[PDB]
Amino acid sequence: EDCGSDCMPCGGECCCEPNSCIDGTCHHESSPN
Numbered sequence: 355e356d357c358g359s360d361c362m363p364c365g366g367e368c369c370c371e372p373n374s375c376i377d378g379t380c381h382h383e384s385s386p387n
Contacts, residue, residue: 357370369381
Protein backbone atom coordinates (compact mmCIF):
# COMPACT_ATOMS: atom_id res chain seq x y z
CA GLU A 355 0.00 0.00 0.00
CA ASP A 356 1.16 3.53 -0.82
CA CYS A 357 0.15 7.06 0.17
CA GLY A 358 0.80 9.36 -2.77
CA SER A 359 3.27 10.50 -5.42
CA ASP A 360 6.52 9.77 -3.59
CA CYS A 361 4.72 10.39 -0.30
CA MET A 362 4.83 8.48 2.98
CA PRO A 363 2.42 7.92 5.90
CA CYS A 364 3.05 10.45 8.67
CA GLY A 365 0.71 9.74 11.57
CA GLY A 366 -2.50 9.68 9.56
CA GLU A 367 -0.96 12.21 7.19
CA CYS A 368 0.90 12.22 3.87
CA CYS A 369 4.27 13.92 3.38
CA CYS A 370 5.13 14.35 -0.30
CA GLU A 371 8.41 15.56 -1.82
CA PRO A 372 10.45 17.49 -1.71
CA ASN A 373 9.40 17.15 1.93
CA SER A 374 10.14 13.97 3.87
CA CYS A 375 8.29 11.79 6.38
CA ILE A 376 10.58 11.47 9.40
CA ASP A 377 10.10 11.38 13.17
CA GLY A 378 6.44 10.80 12.39
CA THR A 379 6.26 14.37 11.13
CA CYS A 380 6.61 16.19 7.80
CA HIS A 381 10.21 17.38 7.57
CA HIS A 382 10.09 20.32 5.16
CA GLU A 383 12.88 20.77 2.61
CA SER A 384 14.71 24.04 1.99
CA SER A 385 16.87 25.12 -0.95
CA PRO A 386 19.95 27.04 0.24
CA ASN A 387 21.64 28.54 -2.82
